Amino acid sequence: PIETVPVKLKPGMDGPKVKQWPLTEEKIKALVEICTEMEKEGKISKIGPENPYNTPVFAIKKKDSTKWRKLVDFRELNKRTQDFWEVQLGIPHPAGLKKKKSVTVLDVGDAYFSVPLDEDFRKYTAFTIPSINNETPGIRYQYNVLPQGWKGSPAIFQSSMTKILEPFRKQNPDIVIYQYMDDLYVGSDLEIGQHRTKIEELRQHLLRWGLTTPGYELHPDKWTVQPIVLPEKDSWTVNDIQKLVGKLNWASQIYPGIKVRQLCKLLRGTKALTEVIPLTEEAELELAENREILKEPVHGVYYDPSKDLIAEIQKQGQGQWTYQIYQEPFKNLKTGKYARGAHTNDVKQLTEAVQKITTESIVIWGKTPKFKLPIQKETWETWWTEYWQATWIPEWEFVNTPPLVKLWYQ
Amino acid sequence: SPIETVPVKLKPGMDGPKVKQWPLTEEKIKALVEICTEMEKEGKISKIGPENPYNTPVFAIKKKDSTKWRKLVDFRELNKRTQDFWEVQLGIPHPAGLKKKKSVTVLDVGDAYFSVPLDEDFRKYTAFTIPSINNETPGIRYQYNVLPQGWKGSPAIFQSSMTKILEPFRKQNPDIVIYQYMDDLYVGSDLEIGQHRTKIEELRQHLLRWGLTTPDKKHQKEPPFLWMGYELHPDKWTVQPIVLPEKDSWTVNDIQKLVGKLNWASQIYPGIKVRQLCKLLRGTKALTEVIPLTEEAELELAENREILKEPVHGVYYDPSKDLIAEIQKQGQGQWTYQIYQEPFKNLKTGKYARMRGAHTNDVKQLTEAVQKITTESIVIWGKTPKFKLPIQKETWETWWTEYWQATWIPEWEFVNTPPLVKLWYQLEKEPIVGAETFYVDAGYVTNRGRQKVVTLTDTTNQKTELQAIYLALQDSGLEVNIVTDSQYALGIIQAQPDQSESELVNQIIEQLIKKEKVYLAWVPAH
Ligand SMILES: CC(=O)c1ccc(C)cc1N[C@H](C(N)=O)c1c(Cl)cccc1Cl
């Protein structure tokens, strides 16, 4: 077939050998029908016991679709694949995309199967359909074409893409199209009705060039930060003011101009928690000043492409959550809130929150963040695929949320 | 066999073995030659030539019913140099996951490794020398051509090759179930005897079509099969019988092995207990130290002997049925569960006592228990069980609302089998009007003038933060307002434990349950 661009692992590194987390029967079935079809077209090939590598695989469902989708967790392989610089553009980031009234996201993962994979590389793509109760050691395959979800993928298809995206890029240069992994982001400010059709075009304009394309329809322009909040009471008690002094002194870690001296003086003495303190003139003013400082994100905090994007989520209750994206502790680039009344279930709301914060980190910085999840691994590992719809998998860690750090956000 | 070879390579960055053969007694040398000649004559091995610098040492030793020796080859060195392979079957099937058969046979696959071809470009490293005893005489050089015993890749190439051979037969015969485990072959079906025995001989044919040897009827083994600590019948399974000896003197070692067996037995024996037997282990100075059976260790040991008297077995899986899982509280921090599809017809049983964390409550613990079982269900049956829990929806809901961690548990129905899990106490959401306010630091002072100080040196900084709270709890009335600066204490009480491995904590929890209303608040330190 056509000619392969030679791929290599960072010098010194070996292929990934990751364990497949157990899958339910319905899931292995889905994957078995999918892989047989791919096997017949020649995209994947059965392998022997002499390949010791493994990447985990999952079957995730679609929105308004009865179709399953195979999902490969290439995270370990992607960290071990040669650094990718493309001798064409280096595919930078459209700082402008974020300012767009509308952004549509297209899956172009399929473009990838029309291109062969360096032969010596194939072995590293080894994956396993596990068998129930360990009856067998599983059905082993490797890829012959560009796998969806690998980093070298869009790198290698990088040229045929611009070639397909030429009539369009100039037949209407008011459109910003960014490509991240297997996704395509089309942005503009057109009126919602005309935008929706200019996408229909692109779709059609693509099939006829060497690919097919099927999700989200976001609006970055009305996305905002949730600043720190101060309660506004009719009458204050000792408890109220103690909570206030506590929140306030955590906050002064970020905004140093925060004073609590007067507040603190209204609170010296073993007074009863429910004693109502009528406010002093100086304390009223010190509060007024503090609110003012908290009205905007702290000054001079900057996105450094050299550092990792970290995302922390907190369970607020009643189907509510709060998150913060930062690179340095306190130095927050963004903060936000997520709600779905409380009902569906924790794991679902959390998975949906993760997909949304990732989409936004991409649209804004063109990078996915590393999450700190408030859940036990075994529960997450068991259910996340039940709700996942994205085609990438960000990295995550599992943590313990402090009760204070939690309420200091709402 | 006329099968395709699997390509093998040595670990990168190294060469093959170049090991010195050990001087061989002329007699054991004579034997190596009778073994090796018959083999070159079977094409298993073949004579090579000089400056093929590769060499692995051999020798001989015999066993049962013969005056002929067994050849051994020391591959530890080639093994070191050889690449790794995909985990020769990693996982072990749990009996409870099988569907019942009507007839089952186990074919023994002999010298099969010798029936599979070794990659041609690797036989070169499997060279070894057979020394002839005369002075300036031979010293015959050989290399392997089939799969050598005890070589790193043999277990995996064979299995793979076998899987390939058995394929058309499985396609042609979808009724029959074949499970490959090392050298053995369990072949079972739902055919009537005569029919079943015929297929077996059809199979033995197919395997001979590629040179494989198996034993016919009289030399075959019959159920039960004792496999991996289990006992397997066509229609039921069980754990290999457990022996509970009678003795007066029990060493530490004795008790460990006995706790060992009791745990293994609990996968089908509902009710096994080892809490008392385990306590015997406390502070032991030697494996040979004998420990006196506490009066409670005796009872436990005795009740255990009872359960094991009666022999239970597990039923197999019926895919056409739902999986029900049931959990009960068997003591503090002890849970038991049974997995069945038909009331009282257990596929599997188990205990859970994971102390995840230093402090917990029953709701968090039931939740973790439900997680384990779930993962376990998925691995054995590919699906999750529908649970029956002794906790009301409203108790469950009420706690995971106020807990900061996300969690989620599948479909469950409330089962009224006491003891029922309940929340022992609830800290207030807002301060209490007119309840005294204790300000803690070990000591305290209240808005009513009250005061107290205490001195403790045998402490940690955390323990004192908790001491003070206890004191406040101790001296207060039925409704209290407590204020602390300690982030630690708040974290602990705030999570609402009902058990801990901390004495102090268990005393506080007690105060906590007696009180009417309690509000705990935090403020920064200085
Ligand atoms: C996964 C499997 O089928 C299996 C694993 C281990 C053993 C000892 C026998 C196995 N299968 C055998 C079999 N192949 O007939 C078996 C079944 Cl299917 C049901 C009841 C008893 C027996 Cl022995």
Swiss-Prot record, chain A:
Changing E41A: Confers resistance to lamivudine. Changing G187V: Confers resistance to efavirenz and nevirapine. Changing V186I: Confers resistance to HBY 097. Changing Y185H: Confers resistance to atevirdine, efavirenz, loviride and zidovudine. Changing K100R: Confers resistance to emivirine and trovirdine. Changing N51D: Confers resistance to stavudine. Changing T212Y: Confers resistance to zidovudine. Changing L71I: Confers resistance to HBY 097. Changing S153A: Confers resistance to pyrophosphate analog PFA. Changing S65G: Confers multi-NRTI resistance. Changing M181T: Confers resistance to abacavir, didanosine, emtricitabine, lamivudine and zalcitabine. Changing K100E: Confers resistance to atevirdine. Changing V176D: Confers resistance to efavirenz, tivirapine and trovirdine. Changing G187C: Confers resistance to efavirenz and nevirapine. Changing H205Y: Confers resistance to lamivudine, pyrophosphate analog PFA and zidovudine. Changing S65Y: Confers multi-NRTI resistance. Changing P116S: Confers resistance to lodenosine. Changing V103M: Confers resistance to delavirdine, efavirenz and nevirapine. Changing G317E: Confers resistance to abacavir, lamivudine and zidovudine. Changing V72M: Confers resistance to stavudine and zalcitabine. Changing K67S: Confers resistance to didanosine and stavudine. This is p51 RT. The lineage of its organism: Viruses, Riboviria, Pararnavirae, Artverviricota, Revtraviricetes. The gene is gag-pol.
Curated annotation (Swiss-Prot), chain B:
Changing T213F: Confers resistance to zidovudine. Changing L212F: Confers resistance to ph-AZT and zidovudine. Changing M182T: Confers resistance to abacavir, didanosine, emtricitabine, lamivudine and zalcitabine. Changing H206Y: Confers resistance to lamivudine, pyrophosphate analog PFA and zidovudine. Changing I133L: Confers resistance to delavirdine, efavirenz and nevirapine. Changing E87K: Confers resistance to pyrophosphate analog PFA. Changing W86G: Confers resistance to pyrophosphate analog PFA. This is Reverse transcriptase/ribonuclease H.
